[PDB]
């Protein structure tokens with residue numbers, strides 16, 4: 001089976017709306033979400049449907065852009081570095097689980113290039 005998805009709602013967790021977090025939604029997430037290669041990353045890995053029975057044996061910190069999108073639109077984060085870490089966890093998981101040169105790795109690399117381009121210009125905190 002699949003594990004429960006990562007948390008996207010937790011009223012116990014202190015929250016902020018900051019200009020950096022707004023940029024992560026309006027620029028970073030939106031740029032990657034509309035990309036031709038976004039679709040494998042737009043929801044948690046469905047290891048049943050995709051016949052990857054070892055996926056969650058290997059990947060213990062799952063992350064995906066559907067979860068990130070919910071976290072941003074639900075104001076789940078306290079700071080931008082939390083969200084940046086989620087993106088990097090998503091990319092790292094893909095490189096760890098898969099083989100170099102796989103289509104999915106090429107897709108992650110193209111998304112990560114754009115990610116790096118956008119967070120290079122993360123605005124200074126207001």
Ligand SMILES: CN1C[C@@H](c2ccccc2)CC1=O
Pocket residue numbers: 040041045050093094097098104
């Ligand atoms: C990020 N994902 C999703 C899974 C997948 C979906 C579609 C094509 C190839 C691979 C495995 C993986 O690492």
